[PDB]
Amino acid sequence: TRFERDLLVELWKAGFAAIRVAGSGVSPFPCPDIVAGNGRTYLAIEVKMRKELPLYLSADEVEQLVTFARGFGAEAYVALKLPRKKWRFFPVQMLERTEKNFKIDESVYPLGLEIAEVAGKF
Amino acid sequence: TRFERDLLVELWKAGFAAIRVAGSGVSPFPCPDIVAGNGRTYLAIEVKMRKELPLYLSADEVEQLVTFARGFGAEAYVALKLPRKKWRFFPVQMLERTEKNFKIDESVYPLGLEIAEVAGKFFQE
Amino acid sequence: TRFERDLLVELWKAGFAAIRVAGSGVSPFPCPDIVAGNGRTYLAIEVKMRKELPLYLSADEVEQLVTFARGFGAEAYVALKLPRKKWRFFPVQMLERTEKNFKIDESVYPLGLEIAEVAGKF
Amino acid sequence: TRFERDLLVELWKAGFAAIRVAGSGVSPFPCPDIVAGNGRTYLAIEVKMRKELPLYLSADEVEQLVTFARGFGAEAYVALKLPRKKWRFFPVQMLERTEKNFKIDESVYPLGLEIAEVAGKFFQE
């Protein structure tokens, strides 16, 4: 919450029109935490922060995001913020599947994209 | 607020993936009341409900939108809900200007788009 | 709606503390249209009115009522009002099952209870 | 109204089948704010939320309840929600009277029942 704000910041710097969503869960429809675009690229974002790794994500959590992202016309991304470390971005494709869910461990965080890679990637 | 809710639904019903911008202005940036995409069409929407025409809009409010829309990659629209009428969507280009603000009056309102025509304005072509 | 009021009336006459429910469907939980009791007997009621017969009821409609009735500690009843005719009461047990739903036709209405039978029945 | 909603849930969570009386008074009769049953226990509930004790109740309001409760076949209770405290259930018999009204004050409040104790007051015995 105190994070989203400055992530939007990081985001406006990268040349992204960012916005937050007013009441994520609310309606029977899915919702990301942030939706940002820049003309060529669109992004649905699940915003996460943790003291340490790994980051866990229920299949249903990811399911929702991808559904919105897909149906809206944007890219499923998870923003992970670790203490004093800068935001890394993980496309759902990149998430480690588990026995039945998802996660990001030491062996995955490395691949995350700094916000800039994400933009100039297209 | 009752209709940001209402409209929002109408959009989903219309195959659009819509969202209410967290604080139509609480954010430290220019913001729309609603943002909707659907794969081909993207909307920066300013949501208004009046009891009767005209509807005046601050030139501020407008640049605010166009700037955002021009920047996000969306078409800037004004959605206007009039009593016992359906929602009406107006591209900003359609807004007639007063001395130094804008307006939708009885001359413009009729030309607003139902939501379908908005999504299906993409198929032209 | 204009009916419930006077049915409550019919009900207060029969010596029933009746009440209406504020927003039937509302919550994820089931709701009758009226809940009335008199010390010995309790009643969950689906209030229906029709110009003519038969009365149709989805399995899910009845399902809800019975669930509330059962879990509350009352009796599943359907109040049927026909034009100029007095209210008849049908316990769910009494409803005609169809291919997959429920209903009340000419051959069933007859069995309905006038509000008084329902009270002094216990 | 926010808490009639709230409480109502707490009851369901507590295995009670509860309902909000359509118009806590709009009906042409004496009515409770809430009615809940669960097969063994039946509640005629007057719902109040104060910011701090005491809570005064019109002797009217009370007979209204007892009469209904005595008539429906339910135990008449007052549910009182105090800030940052859980709901508290008070049988009418527990209400101390002022000169010609009633009250729950700092002497009574402590003795209110959590909801469980209400449902489990049935098992005594």
Place this chain on the structure above:
DNA sequence: GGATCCCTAAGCTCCATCGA
């Protein structure tokens, strides 16, 4: 630390002003 919560600031439609 976490949750509740209290409260202050702002936001939206309407009304009336002000003006035409």
Place this chain on the structure above:
DNA sequence: TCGATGGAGCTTAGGGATCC
């Protein structure tokens, strides 16, 4: 400074403080 009675506003939301 409480103790009980008789009279008016009613939004949404984000932050600091507070109880626990």
Place this chain on the structure above:
DNA sequence: GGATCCCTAAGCTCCATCGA
């Protein structure tokens, strides 16, 4: 007929009075 809708009346907690 049906739906929306506009609007007026009432309801609840709080505050201040009034009183102690």
Place this chain on the structure above:
DNA sequence: TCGATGGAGCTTAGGGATCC
């Protein structure tokens, strides 16, 4: 009697009227 601008209330609900 409109035409555009600058300033305040904000509840819930049931019924008559109104548009369609």
